[PDB]
Structure 1
Amino acid sequence: LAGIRLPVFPSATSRWVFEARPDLPTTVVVSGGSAPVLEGPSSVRDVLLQA
């Protein structure tokens, strides 16, 4: 119900790439302290709300 999604399996049709280009970081904002900041990838941040 909370949408926790278990990882998807590769279906045995491709080899593993040990080092693809890393995942892009995400930014956050606050109105009064208008200076933006960054803290991490989208796939990871959601889990903290999901739990």
Structure 2
Amino acid sequence: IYTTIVIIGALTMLAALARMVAATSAVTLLSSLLLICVVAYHAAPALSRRLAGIRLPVFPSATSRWVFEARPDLPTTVVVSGGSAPVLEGPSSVRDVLLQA
């Protein structure tokens, strides 16, 4: 619900602002918004990726060869109010993926 408000607010602000700084015309402001929306529908799935913080790491293996036998990451411990007894979930790096998505 909040995202919907931001988009109509932002695009309407730019519409009124154009009419304020210059007379121009209504047909032109309406036609311009239409074109901005057509391109926005194509950007939506990518724009939605970055806002959710999904990051794509890319580098030439740290400028080093692979170490297949590397010591794996330590699993994180979690608790619940009622389920006060702690239990380990798994690698911290992988838990975020289930929230970000």
TM-score interval, normalised by the smaller of the two chains = 0.7 to 0.9
- Shift of the 33–11 alpha-carbon distance from structure 1 to 2, 3 Å rule, reads closer
**CA deviation vs aligned residue, 1:2-50 (integer Å, no higher than 9, x gap):** 0001123136621111111111001111112211111111110000000
Going from structure 1 to structure 2, the CA distance change for 1:31 and 1:20 (only over 3 Å counts) comes to same
Higher helix proportion: 2
TM score, norm. by length of structure 2: 0.46
Task: Please list every run of 5 or more consecutive structure 2 residues that lacks an aligned counterpart in the other structure.
Answer: 1-50
Between the two proteins, what is the percent identity of the paired residues? 100
TM-score of the two chains, using structure 1 as the length reference: 0.83
**Residue in 2 aligned with 1:37?**
87
Structure 1 residues 31 and 19: CA distance shift in structure 2, 3 A: same
**Poorly superposed stretches of 4+, deviation over 6 Å:** none
Say which one has the larger Rg. 2
Structure 1 gap segments, 5+ residues each: none
Structural RMSD (CA): 1.6
